[PDB]
Write a protein that binds this ligand. Structure first.
Ligand code: CLA
Ligand code: CLA
Ligand code: CLA
Ligand code: CLA
Ligand code: CLA
Ligand code: CLA
Ligand code: CLA
Ligand SMILES: CCCCCCCCCCCCCCCC(=O)OC[C@H](COP(=O)(O)OC[C@@H](O)CO)OC(=O)CCCCCCCCCCCCCCC
Ligand SMILES: CC1=CCCC(C)(C)[C@H]1/C=C/C(C)=C/C=C/C(C)=C/C=C/C=C(C)/C=C/C=C(C)/C=C/C1=C(C)CCCC1(C)C
Ligand SMILES: CC1=CCCC(C)(C)[C@H]1/C=C/C(C)=C/C=C/C(C)=C/C=C/C=C(C)/C=C/C=C(C)/C=C/C1=C(C)CCCC1(C)C
Ligand SMILES: CC1=C(C/C=C(\C)CCC[C@H](C)CCC[C@H](C)CCCC(C)C)C(=O)c2ccccc2C1=O
Lengths: 145, 61, 741, 137, 150, 74, 73
């Protein structure tokens, strides 16, 4: 919230249309339309079917952040017992498969712990958060000015 | 304290700490926690009764 | 013997139990010591199998609940018909269907919400509707608000009849378990009577009412000038003008001279050039043939007269060397468990809903529905969602059967037992195939995104680069295009113009044109496969491991819906079939969202559009799907960012409601994550602090406040997640399509 | 002691049985007498037929063995089920009915392990047992 | 009838099925190098690597970054060699970590046996990749996948 | 400028979360009630319920009314 | 050195890019610094910071890096 506020206010001032913030900041559709949707254009056009520019890296990292964020959703919504009962079947399959039972694990493959899963999901969520916004802020500022 | 008396709990770990219950029985055999207190408020585990010692209960007025 | 036996006055109608919530349950009838009691009341309201051990009681409750549901549905239909009769622009739409937007809802002018009464057309301003009721009525031959009023009256009368029947068959004449356990008789009657006579009556209605009225409407006659259906019924000469074979009568029918009816019973195929829908003269023949088929099918089972089959004999006779006893015990399982039947019926109903969505878009069945793009999109996505939910419910009730009504004694070395005895092979192989599909379907999109970002556009998986052509789908499309005259000799046109052919245009707008499949279509189809397979993995894994597993050998004792089995064994969270349904519902949402997005973009980019005087069609998006749908950036920019403009710029318009619902659905979706990412201990401790605050003021509820159970927290999170996501897509789709059509 | 010649409950096979870890680390066994040939549910998955007389069954986990025992005790009325643990060396040990009587009822001879002489509220704090060998008890 | 307990053991985590215990399956598995009798771990590795480094050159040759270049085949061989080295390293670390130095007489489940297996696999893989490179460079039908006959 | 501001604000939030986490860790591990007999720290623990309940009330206050004004404007 | 002349016109480059995955289009797209090789443009403000401090030549920055290596040691 803090950085959204800072960035939108300063972007509007830099382009000289501070009235846009003054008028659209009062409802959430204003933020969704005149700040996110409006300023994501150069970033999402970093690469396109018709070419690419230097912002392509930031577009790729934007999508990267979305991906890792949604991946963290996995660890945060899905909990251990399901994965443990699935890894059991996987271990059975490996032990029972010819030409791959010649190889065996030295550490029993188990599911992640409860606290471990919370931490991994939190880390994925945080990395997505930070990388998505870093891309957005740098690419939109560089494409607008 | 005697049977059918209101007693406030003084056990810190108790769901009814500093809360009032009714003494249902006091066993004089010599067990660790003789008094038995009933409560109207159920605990998280769903039990409305417990066994307390004489030093963990104070009669109310 | 298939016979009727009922108990008279089993339950006395009285309000005594209306004032005793939880009466149905022994643990709940005591009273609410905590707030968990309130939630349990609703979670266990309709779990009749946990109220009593009496199959007769459960079956009677289910019968009456079905009657109540039918009354509710009839009330719904009567309301829709009444709104069409009183609060709609149906007559104006009949006059000019291609210019006035259908509308049957009006809002009151209270807080400025009157803006939602947009200029739909026909001198009428209301809320544009996307349910297709106007086209249903036009196909039915309705041309007045009087007929719609009579339809609403019939719906209300049927709702009353259904509610009375439910009360009567619970409290006055409740059938017995021997009455309920008549699978042969029930299937005979459903197939023959319900379905066969329903489609026979509908064929008669189409032959006597819909066909001539729609013939005149397509001829351009005014709805006021068209005669009335009883005029058509009693004036065989008037009908013999439009369809000259009614002068012949029913002698051709009874002499098997059926070709005499080719004028109104034909196999034309294609789409009506004027309306853009299917030929009602084809639908009449379709329903007549279905009536014959169903009435014949309903004579297969033995009831009272020796002739017929016994499903027990059939099932027990169907066994082989890989299956041991085969289908033995399944007849008993299915006539003793309502949950097994519910699972089968829900799976079939959901699959049917999905099939219906696909067909009803490619073969627009109603007059003027194909060029009503909002109606088409809305119906497709709606029925897709219903299908997904029904499939997930089928998984849930399969798990419930496995936990509750599964008995190993009665299932020994049959198919069910053998499945449970090699569940590990099934789940391991499905795991591998899910991983393989995920890789070779999504890593392809990732490869394309990275190559387009690196400037190696010649290394992508695109039609202009490395190609992944769905040659099999294109081959099937070619077959269906060339079938008319060759493999369906007596059909004039293809079943759907989506396979190929000429564009069908109504009102200078595409109704249905060929849909071309390329690399992007190959990719999206394999992603559909991936998502369906993963959902199946979750649901089937839960169902198969409902009773026991290497982790929890005694899980049926814990039940179908339990939170966990503790932090031991490493952690046993979400190890129940209920939690499998929960995760599989998340994944069904994923699958259906991708499916409906694929439909929306593909249809707006390669089917829908306006046709110029040059015969060339310009589409809503204009071919952006072929070269943009191959990259996640393409989907994010050319579909979501590009098409969200209509909904985010809807303030001040009649779609401002769609904008507001867009934002509110976002709110609910985010609000779900509080329940999904969190646990019960934190909220119970926060409630402890709040209760201290309340006690400091010498008051607190007698019903002690408790945080939601673990299962209930998961359920609330999932419900809010699904509502928010589906509502966001709802607002987005409706705003976009009502703005650009 | 355990007799390795007791027949087995004529199971048809499953993929939920024991694996290489049973041959390498530990393999549990359960023996019980049945008055007739009933159908019971394997803790691993599937149905099996117990024989009239003694029945021996091999599992990978003590929890599986005890779940089967609980099923026999509650569903059926068999309570002579004994549980053993077998190592690759052939060191079959005896576990359930440890003293010949189920743990749910007191028996003379047992010694209390893990019993504490106060309530949980009297536990010490980690600050008090920090950098020391004291126990929070 | 066709599906039965594994090795007549009803309680082992396996089932005897046509795919798992048929005559064709047993013959094929028992005649593969990983199971054939008499082969040294080195010869097993030789055969397996020969077989694997052959198929590796094609995917790299026909879909690699330099596939539309005149150095596509050499690039492919080179990338196969790199992957073979990586997999040989994997085999070596797996051998040193999993198998302790006790001597079980080269049974492929020993330190010495696995060392011989990985050495043979490396040699055979590099040799097979080179053989495939030679054949592709010299035969047009393989460079065009048959599109020379068109 | 935008990159620097976002950078330092995110670092600030991480550091604040860590400060509170390590305060909790101190309470779990290093707190000696007998040593902190009725000083400011023991008093914080004494009226933790008041602190938490009033913090919850102010959170609900702010949330309810800020979100309500935003929705009204929307 | 060419940024300290027209700091309001020249974009400050952080470091060169050497990625064997870049195509010619990407190499060209990232040669925006007038340096004749693909580069990243710094967003950390170290250029402005050092210019204010008193750094003018690349030798000053190199000596600073040498000193900081010595201090790490
Ligand atoms: C300088 C300050 C400082 C110091 C000295 C410590 C010291 C300590 N903290 Mg930490 N802590 C800090 C700041 C600090 N903390 C901050 C700012 C936070 C808030 C985020 C925390 C939150 C915190 C918690 C919640 C806990 C600790 C714990 C601990 C102790 C154990 C550390 C441990 O487990 O290592 C962890 C070792 C690691 C290698 C960390 C792995 C995860 C990190 C975050 C990497 C993830 C990023 C990923 C790699 C990037 C991917 C990039 C992408 C492009 C691919 C230790 C005394 C733990 C403890 O013992 O408590 C009793 C504990 O439970 N700390
Ligand atoms: C079962 C489905 C259904 C649904 C969802 C609706 C929905 C609606 N009806 Mg209703 N309606 C229904 C069935 C239904 N109707 C039936 C079966 C009939 C026939 C008797 C009617 C007859 C009817 C009339 C006569 C009117 C409505 C109106 C309305 C609207 C306002 C109702 C209101 O605010 O009441 C709030 C009332 C409270 C007591 C609260 C609303 C869109 C009104 C409308 O559209 O006005 C513009 C209106 O005047 N309906
Ligand atoms: C609660 C869920 C729900 C809701 C709200 C709706 C809502 C709607 N459906 Mg329905 N629908 C649902 C579930 C639902 N459907 C399911 C589960 C199915 C699959 C069986 C269908 C199948 C379906 C069809 C085939 C059609 C609709 C249509 C409609 C629309 C018009 C309503 C109407 O009166 O149509 C009245 C419906 C008809 C005139 C068509 C009836 C033809 C079917 C084949 C009859 C089947 C009856 C039979 C007894 C069902 C059991 C079959 C089983 C034994 C195999 C409306 C948007 C119609 C539409 O889109 O119109 C534009 C439409 O044609 N729906
Ligand atoms: C349940 C459906 C139904 C019903 C109630 C009727 C009712 C009627 N049909 Mg029939 N009719 C039906 C289905 C039905 N038809 C079907 C499916 C066909 C196609 C084979 C016909 C074809 C047909 C013809 C060709 C004629 C009738 C006629 C009649 C009338 C005299 C009998 C009567 C109104 C006669 C009439 O007077 O039509 C107006 C007549 O000539 N019907
Ligand atoms: C033919 C359809 C059908 C039928 C007859 C049943 C019947 C049953 N189901 Mg259900 N079920 C169905 C479909 C069906 N199901 C489907 C499609 C799914 C997949 C989602 C499920 C998934 C499912 C599960 C996972 C479980 C059941 C259970 C049950 C039993 C008790 C349910 C209960 O008490 O509900 C009472 C009613 C409620 C609690 C109300 C729930 C409604 C929620 C809160 C959402 C409503 C939102 C609504 C649409 C409005 C949104 C708009 C917003 C702005 C307000 C009962 C036998 C339970 C069971 O048997 O447990 C032992 C159980 O655990 N079902
Ligand atoms: C974007 C978010 C996300 C992602 C990536 C995944 C990924 C997965 N989920 Mg899902 N899941 C999600 C959200 C997500 N989930 C959420 C929110 C939930 C909670 C409802 C779940 C709940 C859930 C369940 C309950 C299950 C899954 C399953 C799966 C697996 C499907 C098949 C597979 O392995 O595909 C593989 C493909 C991918 C993981 C895509 C990314 C990989 C790319 C294309 C390749 C990158 C590799 C790269 C070269 C590595 C280099 C490293 C280093 C050099 C830098 C997979 C691990 C199912 C499963 O495991 O069945 C097999 C399963 O049972 N998920
Ligand atoms: C947008 C998503 C969202 C929302 C709305 C909330 C809301 C809340 N969170 Mg947060 N939370 C979220 C996401 C969200 N959270 C996430 C993703 C997490 C990570 C797991 C958390 C984790 C979390 C924790 C750990 C805590 C909170 C707390 C709070 C409260 C903060 C005070 C406040 O704003 O009160 C104002 C209330 C609101 C903004 C919600 C009101 C919603 C509507 C507008 C009210 C009207 C309802 C309407 C009449 C219903 C009609 C529908 C019906 C017919 C079905 C509040 C209940 C704290 C708390 O409980 O403090 C008291 C707390 O301890 N949250
Ligand atoms: C339908 C495809 C059938 C595949 C052959 C299967 C086939 O038709 O077998 C049918 C075979 C015939 O069994 P019986 O003759 O014993 O049973 C006849 C039954 O009517 C009585 O139960 O049953 C089995 O062996 C089931 C094994 C399933 C095999 C599991 C592997 C397939 C899993 C599904 C994945 C398929 C992808 C295929 C591409
Ligand atoms: C399962 C199935 C279904 C449908 C029918 C189908 C046939 C496709 C069948 C599948 C068949 C499959 C998967 C066939 C694949 C065959 C493969 C990978 C064959 C590989 C052959 C390898 C060959 C020659 C290697 C030759 C190597 C040589 C000389 C190496 C020599 C050398 C070595 C080893 C070391 C020193 C250097 C030197 C002297 C060059
Ligand atoms: C000087 C001046 C100039 C302009 C006019 C103005 C009126 C502003 C005037 C006055 C300014 C003043 C008085 C500013 C006030 C700022 C203050 C008081 C800032 C303080 C912020 C406090 C913070 C973060 C506290 C965080 C606390 C934490 C982690 C506590 C963690 C802990 C916990 C949870 C358990 C025990 C251990 C420990 C570590 C203590
Ligand atoms: C927020 C939250 C709570 C606290 C929320 C509670 C106790 C909900 C109580 C809400 C009131 C009583 C509902 C009535 C007010 C609503 C505004 C009206 C809508 C609800 C009805 C439609 C049922 C939990 O208890 C919990 C438990 C387990 C996992 C996650 C969570 C969780 O996320």
């Amino acid at each position: 919230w803090v950085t959204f506020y800072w960035h939108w206010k300063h972007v509007t001032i830099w382009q000289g249309n501070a009235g846009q913030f003054n008028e659209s900041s009062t409802y959430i559709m204003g933020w969704l339309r005149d700040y996110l949707w409006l300023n994501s254009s150069p970033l999402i056009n970093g690469y396109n079917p018709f070419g690419m520019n230097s912002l392509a890296v930031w577009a790729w990292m934007f999508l990267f952040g979305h991906l890792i964020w949604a991946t963290g959703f996995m660890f945060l919504i899905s909990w251990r017992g399901y994965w443990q009962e699935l890894i059991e079947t996987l271990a059975w399959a490996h032990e029972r498969t010819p030409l791959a039972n010649l190889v065996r694990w030295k550490d029993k493959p188990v599911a992640l712990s409860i606290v471990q899963a919370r931490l991994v999901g939190l880390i994925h969520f945080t990395v997505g958060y930070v990388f998505t916004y870093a891309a957005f802020v740098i690419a939109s500022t560089t494409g607008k000015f | 304290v005697k049977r059918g008396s209101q007693v406030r709990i003084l056990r810190k770990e108790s769901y009814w700490y500093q809360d009032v219950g009714t003494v249902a029985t006091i066993d004089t055999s010599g067990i660790r926690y003789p008094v038995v207190v009933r409560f109207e408020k159920v605990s998280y585990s769903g039990v409305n009764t417990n066994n307390f010692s004489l030093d963990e209960v104070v009669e109310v007025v | 013997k298939v016979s009727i036996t009922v108990d008279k006055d089993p339950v006395a109608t009285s309000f005594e139990k209306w004032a005793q919530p939880g009466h149905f349950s022994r643990t709940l009838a005591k009273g609410p010591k905590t707030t968990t009691w309130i939630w349990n009341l609703h979670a266990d309201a309709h779990d009749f199998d946990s109220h009593t051990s009496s199959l007769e009681d459960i079956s009677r409750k289910i019968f009456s609940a079905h009657f109540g549901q039918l009354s509710i549905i009839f009330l719904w239909l009567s309301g829709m018909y009444f709104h069409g009769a009183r609060f709609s622009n149906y007559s104006a739409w009949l006059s000019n269907p291609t210019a006035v937007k259908p509308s049957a809802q009006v809002v009151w002018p209270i807080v400025g919400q009157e803006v939602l009464n947009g200029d739909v057309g026909g001198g009428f301003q209301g809320v544009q509707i996307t349910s297709g009721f106007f086209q249903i009525w036009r196909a039915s031959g309705i041309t007045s608000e009087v007929e719609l009023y009579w339809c609403a009256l019939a719906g209300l009368l049927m709702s009353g009849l259904m509610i009375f029947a439910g009360w009567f068959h619970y409290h006055k004449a409740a059938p017995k378990l021997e009455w309920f356990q008549n699978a042969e008789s029930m299937l005979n009657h459903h197939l023959s009577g319900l379905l066969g006579l329903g489609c026979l009556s509908w064929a008669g209605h189409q032959i006597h009412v819909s066909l001539p009225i729609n013939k005149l409407l397509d001829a351009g006659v005014a709805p006021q000038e068209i005669p009335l259906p009883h005029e058509f019924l009693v004036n065989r000469d008037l009908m013999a003008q439009l369809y000259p074979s009614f002068s012949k009568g029913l002698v051709p029918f009874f002499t098997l001279n059926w070709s005499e009816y080719s004028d109104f019973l034909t196999f034309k195929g294609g789409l009506n050039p004027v309306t853009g829908g299917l030929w009602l003269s084809d639908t009449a023949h379709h329903h007549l043939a279905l009536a014959v088929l169903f009435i014949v099918a309903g004579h297969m089972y033995r009831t009272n007269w020796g002739i017929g089959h016994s499903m027990k004999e059939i099932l027990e006779a169907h066994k082989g060397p890989f299956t041991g006893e085969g289908h033995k015990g399944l007849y008993e399982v299915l006539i003793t468990s309502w949950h097994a039947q519910l699972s089968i019926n829900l799976a079939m109903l959901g699959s049917l809903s999905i099939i219906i969505a696909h067909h009803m878009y490619a073969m627009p069945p109603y007059p003027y529905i194909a060029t009503d793009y909002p109606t088409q999109l809305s119906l497709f996505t709606h029925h897709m969602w219903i299908g997904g939910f029904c499939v997930c419910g089928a998984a849930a009730h399969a798990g419930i059967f496995m936990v509750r009504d599964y008995n190993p004694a009665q299932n020994y070395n049959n198919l069910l037992d053998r499945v449970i005895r090699h569940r590990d092979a099934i789940i391991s192989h499905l795991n591998w195939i899910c991983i393989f599909l995920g890789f070779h379907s999504f890593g392809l999109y990732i490869h394309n995104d990275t190559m387009r970002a690196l400037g190696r556009t010649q290394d992508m998986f695109s039609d202009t680069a490395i190609q992944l052509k769905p040659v099999f789908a294109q081959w099937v499309q070619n077959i269906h295009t060339v079938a008319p005259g060759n493999t369906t000799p007596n059909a004039l046109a293809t079943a759907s113009y989506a396979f190929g052919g000429n564009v069908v245009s109504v009102g200078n707008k595409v109704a249905m044109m060929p849909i071309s499949l390329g690399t992007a279509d190959f990719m999206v189809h394999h992603i559909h496969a991936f998502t369906i397979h993963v959902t199946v993995l979750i649901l089937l894994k839960g169902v198969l491991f409902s009773r026991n597993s290497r982790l929890i050998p005694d899980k049926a004792n814990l039940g179908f819906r339990f939170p966990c089995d503790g932090p031991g064994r490493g952690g046993t969270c979400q190890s129940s079939a209920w939690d499998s349904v929960f995760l599989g519902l998340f994944w069904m949402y994923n699958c259906i969202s991708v499916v409906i997005f694929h439909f929306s973009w593909k249809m707006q980019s390669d089917v829908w559009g306006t046709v110029q005087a040059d015969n060339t069609v310009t589409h809503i998006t204009g071919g952006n799907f072929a070269q943009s749908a191959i990259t996640i950036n393409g989907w994010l920019r050319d579909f979501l960012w590009a098409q969200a403009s209509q909904v985010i710029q809807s303030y001040g318009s009649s779609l401002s409601a769609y904008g507001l619902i867009f934002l509110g659905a976002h709110f609910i979706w985010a609000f779900s994550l509080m329940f999904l990412f969190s646990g019960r201990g934190y909220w119970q401790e926060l409630i402890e602090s709040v209760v201290w605050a309340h006690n400091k003021l010498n008051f607190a509820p007698a019903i002690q406040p408790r945080a939601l159970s673990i299962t209930q927290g998961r359920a609330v999170g999932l419900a809010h997640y699904l509502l928010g996501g589906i509502g966001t897509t709802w607002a987005f789709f409706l705003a976009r399509i009502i703005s650009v059509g | 002691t355990l007799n390795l010649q007791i027949p087995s409950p004529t199971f048809e096979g499953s993929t939920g049985g024991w694996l290489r870890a049973a041959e390498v680390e530990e393999k549990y066994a359960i023996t019980w007498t049945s008055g007739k040939e009933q159908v019971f549910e394997m803790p691993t998955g599937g149905a099996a037929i117990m024989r009239k007389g003694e029945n021996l069954l091999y599992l990978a986990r003590k929890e599986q063995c005890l779940a089967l025992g609980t099923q026999l005790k509650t569903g059926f009325k068999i309570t002579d089920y004994k549980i053993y643990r077998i190592f690759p060396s052939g060191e079959v040990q005896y576990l359930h009915p440890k003293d010949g009587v189920f743990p749910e009822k007191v028996n003379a001879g047992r010694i209390g392990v893990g019993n504490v002489s106060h309530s949980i509220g009297k536990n010490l704090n980690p600050s008090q047992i920090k950098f020391t060998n004291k126990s929070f008890n | 009838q066709f599906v039965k307990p594994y090795n007549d053991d009803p309680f082992v985590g396996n089932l005897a099925t046509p795919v798992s215990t048929s005559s064709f399956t047993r013959s094929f598995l028992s005649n593969l190098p990983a199971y054939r009798s008499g082969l040294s771990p080195l010869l097993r590795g030789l055969e397996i690597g020969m077989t694997h480094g052959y198929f590796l050159v094609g995917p790299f040759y026909k879909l690699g970054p330099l596939r539309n270049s005149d150095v596509a085949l050499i690039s492919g061989l080179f990338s196969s060699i790199g992957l073979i080295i990586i997999l040989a390293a994997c085999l070596a670390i797996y051998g040193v970590v999993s198998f302790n130095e006790d001597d079980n007489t080269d049974s492929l489940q020993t330190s010495r046996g696995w060392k011989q297996f990985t050495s043979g696999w490396l040699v055979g893989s590099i040799g097979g990749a080179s053989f495939a490179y030679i054949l592709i460079s010299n035969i047009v039908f393989l460079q065009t996948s048959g599109l020379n006959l068109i | 400028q935008a990159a620097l501001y976002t950078h330092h604000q995110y670092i600030a939030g991480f550091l604040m979360v860590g400060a509170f986490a390590h305060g909790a860790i101190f309470f779990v591990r290093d707190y000696d009630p007998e040593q902190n007999k009725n000083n400011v720290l023991a008093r914080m623990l004494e009226h933790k319920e008041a602190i938490i309940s009033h913090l919850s009330w102010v959170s609900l206050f702010l949330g309810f009314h800020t979100l309500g004004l935003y929705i009204h404007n929307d | 050195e060419q940024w300290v002349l027209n700091p309001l016109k020249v974009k400050p480059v952080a470091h060169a890019i050497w990625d064997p995955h870049f195509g010619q289009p990407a190499v060209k797209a990232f040669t925006k610094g007038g340096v004749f090789y693909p580069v990243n443009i710094a967003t950390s403000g170290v250029y402005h910071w050092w210019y204010t401090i008193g750094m003018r030549t690349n030798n000053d920055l190199y000596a600073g890096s040498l000193f900081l290596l010595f201090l790490s040691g």
